[PDB]
């Protein structure tokens, strides 16, 4: 917007540590499943 | 020789050449995309920059300006930075109509000059006169320091309404117009001085929003000039200026967020 | 030192009973007095052994924290505490830097200290099980009367008393026996009771009979002999001290490891100094002129790789213990890889231990029996009404008998109480007639005459269990000649008939071939007496004559062996087309021998020694090229007076070679020798006659059942199932492990480049640092460790049993080829993909790559809270920061993007992965607990604290995938070339 433009000096880096940490997470699940594919 | 003859030293060094050759050829296209998807006018990320820093001319050793009123070569430190600041906001500087504009001498409201654009050319930035900065070689005692705020483009500085309650409650409060910088240190050992445009202890919001360095050269953006005249003598006073406004925040860590750390001494 | 008891010993069992009391003043009927022994005691000193003195584990585990990459982490970890301590004294830091930094290093070292401690093992105890040899007393006559004693405070003279089943107590002179017979598997390996005499009958005082040895034991009879050694001068004693006091010797793979430590080290060194003299000639202060150095060592040192190697060791000694073969040290797990030459032992090791039945001769026909464990060959006759005969005099004319509660144990693996012929006789009738004991119920022995010195036969007389006879039968065994002169007739396919000189020259000829197989024959025959003759009660004497001994029937002959293991001839040829030499080193005598080797395929069909050219030609041995035999035989008795040049012409000259009669310290001569000539040596033994030779093996494997205590000691490898098959699978695991390294140890070193690049950019750009040291520890001890291990795990590229041993001195585990691949090439490409990154997250926070260059100044000033940036915008000082921390960020994450492929790559040396696949799981879990971890380190809250690392934008983890790609397709381009022409040129040059 204008003088309303405060959106572009901010980012949501909460949602993207949210987001960053399921991911994360559940690369470390997928890697479970496959090295337990025999132990 | 070391590992083989000199028909391998050769073709092991024709390899690495063509390789070597072609990797800086392969790095600088990749660079040269990556500036392809960039902006001449704004960068692509402004969100660390957000909450504008305040920085002062006086360049402290250590968030420090300890000196002695009866030594000269004792403050000829700081006069050499408070010098090359305001060097810049001479007169001869700011001649004719291009690039510069004569505005309101009383704080105003924010100017626009179109977009981010090439569309026009040099947008034309509003004059400031180092002489609106009154009283300030230096003060040889008691320091009259300049402060700054740190320029982000197409910020506009939102001054804080009277709704509420203010630290220094609505005494001047030019509400509509100026950004206000209030220094503090209990330990009121001192006497607190401002100096500005229109006479406020602001920045005068006409000066905004800046249009960055390509479509905006020579601009100059606002000072407020702060002259600390305290009664007192050799001691470490640690003073904090303070400037207030909606898009305006500090953080424990970084301690120049929209504030200064001072720690005066005029130790004669 | 050791040089000494590497000689055949010198002994008095020449002298007489007499003469030998003069030179140990004693008594040969009252023995030593109370008061002279004790004397004697304090002059020679106790009856014991003392162990050598040892390495104490304190100096053992600080010997490792001064290997190359501890030095300089520790010249790291003290820089850093230099660089605080310059700090604290000048401005005052508040920050942590440095002096966490510099425990972290030390805690780095100490780490990787225990690791190389764990690897560098040595479990010995040899001296301690030859002390448990040495029995807790003895029994000694002193003052004319029997007493016994601590076996210590025995002493050369004095008179000593041993019967079946006690420990020679000590080195003895036989001056009285009675039935004695002794084990002397000690120094023979062999367990057959040797005879004990006062009477001198060998020169050899290894063979006499009138010597008994400590370390053996009385079997039966009674003895008694005087002292002439004790403690370290026994016989075995020496062996002994020569056994525990050999030098334990540097492993290939420890040597291997120390020489890359050379190289690596050796560019960290050049590169830290090269650069640290180039800082101050651009007019970096020392005070950075060392915080630039630290970054050095960190970066150049690779922090993580020897504990990698030592976990990929320990992963491969996993494997191997789930097919019965335990590793007592972990560097064996690769050495029987590089082995270019086996000694092996025979019996026990080759061999079953046990006299078995191999052949029979009936029918005027040569039968072959099944001599393996597990019978896995076929019969050879059962409707023959001769062998029903046979059969029948094997099991009754027998007095040998299954201990009890063995029906659950295999037959062949059952403790027989008997000599071992009459063992052998009766597993083998068991096996294919059933129950043994039942042929011994139906025909009621009735009379015998037990097998005699002077007879050379056995007879028994029995109640025929047909109940239309019931009458007495008379069964006989001895030696085949004696047997044949006692018969008339030969019961042939049932019925009998006269013995003719055919049937007799026929009997010879088989006679002559199962003892040229060096087996030991036997004759069988028998004898139905007339019923009018001697009724259901007629009475036979035993001690005299009472009934023929002459014109017997002829029934036939039956030959027996130590056999070898079922599984060895098939793991000698193995080893032998993996071009590993195959010799035998044995106590044994020489017939046996020799018959044994060609048995397993030591000696291979047609190859002969002198000996045998000699006897075909009908030649003098003189008149014989010695060029012209590849296989030889030699005795231990010839061996001793050969010089160890000889002996290395002996080694040199023949392809098929068999050591016989050998001594202990004769096995330690012949592993010296092809040593000596440059080669890896395994042993394989099971006995304490091998203990020496397994000490000073390369590697020594010992057997677990059969195997002695002290050989098991003695070894570096323990086949807990006598599992012969093991070595092959060893060799096989071993070579390759060391491949799995050199693919481990470059993508270790390959990630190396992109650390040290960014510090040298720093000085010779003065841009803002790229990358942290910290952040390289994430690196090289997190994300690479997993994917670094997993290599461990890959199968072999092609058949590497096909290709010959490893030339320790020109191939190497790492070469130039490697650091080329590694630090030229990939490493460099992923330098490049981290730059990328950095220039992008900067660009896009306003930091464009033309005005970085000279800001560092500005950038690293603390006092400038507002540096310019190209858009005209302000920064102070810690929101400038947080970029060039997120730069440190996604650098980092560029390194394991670009390890990604690196992984993929470093998976194969020579094949391709659309070739070699990806059935690596323990690789693909690398890969997602790679980035797990990354994503973790980055995105969870409070790291940016305690690491610095910050949030990444997703457009952040692409940056370097293009990076990634063309390590990808380079790496598969180049290999296509090696493959495409293994004439050299891709090959010689990058072919790690
Ligand atoms: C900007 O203004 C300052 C004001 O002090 C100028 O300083 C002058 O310097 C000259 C020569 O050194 C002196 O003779 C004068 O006394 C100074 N003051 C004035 C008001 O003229 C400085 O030169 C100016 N800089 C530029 C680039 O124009
Ligand atoms: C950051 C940049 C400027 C550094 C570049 C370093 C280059 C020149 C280095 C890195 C790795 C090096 C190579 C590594 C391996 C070998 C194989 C060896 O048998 C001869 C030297 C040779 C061929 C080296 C020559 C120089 C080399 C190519
Ligand atoms: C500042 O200077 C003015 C003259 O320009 C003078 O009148 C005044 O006293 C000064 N102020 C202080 C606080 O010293
Ligand atoms: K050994
Ligand atoms: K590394
Ligand atoms: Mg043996
Ligand atoms: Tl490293």
Request: aromatic share 10%; net charge negative.
């Given at each position: ?39 | ?18 390789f070597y050759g072609c990797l800086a050829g392969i790095f600088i296209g990749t660079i040269?995309?990556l ?234 | ?749 390959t990630?190396?480049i992109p650390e040290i690049t960014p510090?040298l950019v ?8 790229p990358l ?52 030229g090439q990939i490493g460099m490409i992923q330098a490049l993909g981290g730059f990328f990154s950095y220039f992008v ?8 790559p ?41 650098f980092?994450?560029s390194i394991?993007v670009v390890?990604?492929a ?57 940056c370097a995938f293009p990076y990634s790609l063309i390590i990808?397709?380079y ?22």
């Open positions: 917007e204008g003088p309303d433009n405060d959106e572009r000096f901010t980012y949501d880096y909460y949602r993207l540590r949210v987001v960053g940490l399921i991911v994360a997470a559940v690369l470390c699940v997928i890697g479970i499943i496959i090295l337990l594919a025999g132990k | 020789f070391l590992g083989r003859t000199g028909s391998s030293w050769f073709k092991i060094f024709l390899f690495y050449l063509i040269q995309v500036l392809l998807t960039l902006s001449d006018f704004e960068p692509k990320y402004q969100d660390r920059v957000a909450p504008p820093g305040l920085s002062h001319a006086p360049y402290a050793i250590k968030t420090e300006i300890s000196f002695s009123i009866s030594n000269p070569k004792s403050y000829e430190s700081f006069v050499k930075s408070m010098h090359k600041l305001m060097d810049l906001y001479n007169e001869s500087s700011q001649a004719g109509n291009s690039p510069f504009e004569d505005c309101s001498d009383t704080p105003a409201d924010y100017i626009k000059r179109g977009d981010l654009d090439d569309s026009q050319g040099q947008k034309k930035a509003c004059r400031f006169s180092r002489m609106w900065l009154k009283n300030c070689g230096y003060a040889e005692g008691k320091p009259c320091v300049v402060a700054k705020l740190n320029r982000i483009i197409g910020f506009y500085p939102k001054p804080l309404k009277n709704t509420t309650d203010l630290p220094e409650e609505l005494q001047a409060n030019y509400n509509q117009y100026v950004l206000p910088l209030r220094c503090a240190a209990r330990e009121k050992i001192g006497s607190i001085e401002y100096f500005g445009l229109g006479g406020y202890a602001g920045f005068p919001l006409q000066y905004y929003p800046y249009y960055g360095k390509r479509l905006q050269k020579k601009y100059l953006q606002p000072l407020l000039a702060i002259q600390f005249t305290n009664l007192t003598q050799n001691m470490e006073l640690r003073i904090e200026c303070k400037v207030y406004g909606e898009n305006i925040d500090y953080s424990e860590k970084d301690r120049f967020r929209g504030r200064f750390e001072v720690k005066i001494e005029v130790k004669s | 030192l050791d040089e000494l008891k590497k000689e055949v010993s010198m002994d008095d069992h020449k002298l007489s009973l007499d003469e030998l009391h003069n030179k140990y003043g004693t008594d040969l009927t009252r023995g030593l007095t109370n008061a002279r022994a004790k004397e004697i005691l304090a002059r020679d000193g106790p009856n014991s052994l003392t162990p050598p003195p040892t390495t104490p584990e304190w100096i053992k585990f600080c010997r490792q924290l001064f290997g190359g990459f501890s030095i300089l982490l520790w010249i790291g970890a003290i820089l850093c505490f230099l660089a605080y301590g310059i700090q604290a004294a000048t401005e005052d830091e508040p920050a942590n830097d440095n002096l966490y930094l510099g425990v972290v290093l030390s805690t780095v070292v100490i780490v990787t200290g225990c690791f190389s401690y764990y690897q560098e093992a040595k479990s010995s105890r040899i001296m301690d099980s030859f002390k448990n040899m040495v029995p807790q007393q003895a029994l000694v006559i002193r003052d004319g009367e029997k007493s016994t004693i601590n076996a210590e405070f025995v002493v050369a003279g004095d008179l000593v008393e041993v019967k079946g089943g006690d420990r020679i107590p000590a080195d003895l002179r036989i001056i009285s026996a009675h039935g004695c017979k002794v084990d002397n598997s000690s120094l023979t390996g062999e367990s057959e009771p040797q005879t004990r005499s006062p009477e001198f009958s060998s020169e050899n005082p290894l063979e006499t009979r009138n010597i008994a040895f400590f370390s053996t034991n009385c079997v039966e009879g009674t003895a008694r002999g005087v002292v002439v050694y004790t403690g370290d001068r026994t016989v075995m004693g020496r062996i002994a001290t020569l056994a525990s006091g050999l030098e334990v010797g540097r492993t290939p793979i420890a040597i291997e490891i120390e020489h890359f430590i050379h190289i690596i080290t050796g560019v960290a060194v050049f590169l830290g100094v090269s650069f640290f003299i180039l800082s101050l000639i651009l007019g970096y202060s020392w005070l950075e002129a060392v915080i630039f150095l630290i970054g050095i060592i960190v970066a150049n040192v690779p922090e993580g790789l020897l504990a990698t190697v030592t976990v990929c060791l320990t992963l491969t000694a996993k494997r191997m213990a789930r097919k019965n073969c335990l590793v007592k040290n972990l560097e064996a797990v690769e050495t029987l890889g590089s082995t270019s030459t086996i000694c092996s032992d025979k019996t026990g090791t080759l061999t079953q231990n046990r006299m078995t039945v191999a052949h029979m001769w009936f029918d005027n026909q040569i039968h072959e029996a099944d001599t393996t464990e597990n019978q896995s060959g076929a019969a050879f006759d059962k409707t023959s009404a001769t062998w029903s005969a046979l059969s029948r005099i094997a099991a009754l004319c027998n007095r040998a008998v299954f201990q009890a509660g063995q029906d659950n144990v295999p037959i062949l693996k059952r403790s027989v109480a008997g000599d071992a012929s009459e063992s052998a006789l009766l597993k083998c009738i068991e096996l294919c007639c059933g129950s043994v004991q039942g042929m011994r119920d139906r025909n009621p022995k009735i009379v015998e005459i037990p097998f005699n010195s002077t007879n050379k036969y056995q007879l028994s007389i029995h109640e025929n269990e047909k109940s239309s006879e019931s009458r007495y039968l008379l069964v006989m065994k001895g030696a085949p000649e004696r047997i044949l002169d006692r018969c008339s007739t030969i019961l042939l396919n049932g019925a009998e008939e006269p013995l003719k000189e055919d049937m007799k020259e026929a009997f010879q000829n088989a006679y002559l071939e199962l003892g040229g197989l060096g087996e030991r024959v036997l004759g069988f025959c028998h004898f139905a007496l007339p019923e009018d003759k001697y009724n259901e009660g007629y009475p036979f004497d035993a001690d005299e004559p009472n009934f023929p001994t002459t014109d017997l029937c002829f029934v036939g002959l039956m030959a027996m062996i130590d056999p070898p293991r079922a599984a060895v001839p098939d793991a000698v040829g193995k080893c032998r087309s993996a071009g590993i030499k195959v010799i035998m080193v044995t106590g044994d005598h020489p017939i046996t021998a020799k018959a044994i080797a060609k048995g397993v395929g030591i000696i291979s069909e047609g190859n002969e020694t002198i000996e045998d050219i000699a006897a075909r030609l009908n030649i003098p041995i003189g008149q014989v090229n010695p060029r012209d035999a590849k296989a030889c035989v030699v005795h231990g008795s010839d061996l001793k007076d050969l010089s160890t040049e000889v002996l290395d012409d002996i080694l040199h000259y023949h392809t098929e070679i068999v050591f016989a009669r050998t001594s202990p310290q004769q096995k330690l001569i012949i592993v010296e020798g092809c040593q000596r000539q440059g080669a890896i040596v395994a042993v394989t033994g099971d006995g304490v006659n091998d203990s020496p030779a397994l000490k000073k093996a390369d590697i020594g494997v010992a057997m677990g059942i059969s195997g002695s205590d002290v050989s098991k000691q003695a070894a570096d490898m323990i086949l807990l199932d006598d599992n012969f098959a093991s070595i092959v699978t060893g060799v096989e695991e071993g070579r390759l492990i060391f491949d799995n390294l050199k693919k481990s140890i470059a993508y270790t070193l990630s190396n510090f720093f000085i010779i750009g003065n841009v803002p640092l942290g040291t910290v952040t390289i520890l994430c690196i090289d001890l997190g994300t690479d460790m997993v994917p670094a291990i997993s290599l461990a795990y890959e199968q072999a590229e092609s058949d590497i049993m096909k290709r010959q041993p490893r030339n320790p001195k020109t191939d190497k585990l790492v070469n130039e080829r490697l650091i080329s691949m590694a630090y997250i900067l660009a896009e926070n306003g930091f464009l033309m005005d970085l260059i000279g800001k560092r100044v500005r950038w690293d000033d603390r006092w400038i809270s507002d540096v310019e940036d190209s858009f005209g915008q302000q920064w102070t000082y810690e929101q400038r920061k947080i970029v060039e921390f997120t730069c440190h960020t996604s980092f994450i394991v390890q990604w690196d992984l993929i790559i470093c998976k194969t040396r020579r094949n391709s992965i659309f070739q070699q696949g990806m059935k690596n799981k323990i690789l693909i879990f690398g890969l997602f607990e790679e980035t797990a971890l990354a994503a973790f380190l980055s995105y969870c809250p409070g790291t940016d604290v305690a690491l610095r690392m910050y949030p990444l934008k997703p457009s952040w983890w692409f990808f397709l790496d598969e381009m180049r290999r296509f070339i090696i493959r495409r022409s293994p004439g050299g040129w891709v090959e010689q040059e990058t072919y790690y």
